[model samples]
Target: MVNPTVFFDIAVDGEPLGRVSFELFADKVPKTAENFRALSTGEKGFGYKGSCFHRIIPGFMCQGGDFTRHNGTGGKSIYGEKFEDENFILKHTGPGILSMANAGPNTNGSQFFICTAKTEWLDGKHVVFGKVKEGMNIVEAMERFGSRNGKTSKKITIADCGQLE
Candidate 1:
């Protein structure tokens, strides 16, 4: 199991999107770290650079991970991958909680969302993988101006993600 903090550098079009560090509880949720380790990237524009925030609820939060969307709807549906719901013990108490996006159990496939507000309703329904330890302003910025109905008021780019143990 890794330590408590995992740092990541987020950028867009060569512009830094501020550093987004996270606290990964590997001891509590090993699959979460395993997933991040398997997906974290260093190559230019490899992970989430051109991805879209896709869905936005002004009073709520902004959603992304639409790798298949020209906007933010169609993501590669790799169903039956792994449903670690039984391992989802962490609580989605509020903002900065990075949880897997799913219509149902075991439906995660590189898709995730961040809560702008406390999502107590999602207590045990989603996997709370990590929490943003820094640069939450960028996430707040995305929620502030992200589009509605799959229309991005501004471009959403993730740029890069690297493991921080």
Candidate 2:
């Protein structure tokens, strides 16, 4: 099956940035894909909504999913606070690839990142489970203000998020 697409309505400092849709490779990594899907849908009452993209790197990627802390150090998988990596079947071949942002091996939680550029060094380290199907231009706009410190001058809010039919 062609798995359903998910999306985020992003904003910077309260201004709309546009909708970014992603195609989850549930077949490649079912566990990882389900984690993100449940979070985006927010059926659990708390989710990526009201959360901010806490980390941004202009030439690399933007990271978020910390609805609990709004920073890099906190976030929990749908399973629990943490979960094991499903597999490293997919590669971060280029920009717009959706990959897990973990602290170490099998440390994946709710946090994830989108490649703003080709990230060869991330291969085999982060779990690449999805990629953009539309609205990549919005990601480019977010990448523009990213810093080496992984912070952004403008607060990037995931204004809203949910599964698309």
Candidate 2 residue lDDT tens string, 1-165: 557689999998999889999999998888889889889999887789889999998888999998888878789888866888888878889989999999899999899999988998888999999999998999999887789999789899999999998
Model number with the top TM-score: 2
Q: What's model 2's lDDT at 90? A: 86
Error of 1 at 18 (Å): 2.5
lDDT string for model 1 (1-165, tens) is 364564545444446666666676677766664554445542323345456566766657767766656454455322225444546688888888887777777666566778888988987777788888787887776676654453456555666566655
Candidate 1 lowest-lDDT run of ten: 40-49
Candidate 1, number of clashes: 1
Taking all chains together, each candidate's TM-score versus the true structure is 0.76, 0.97
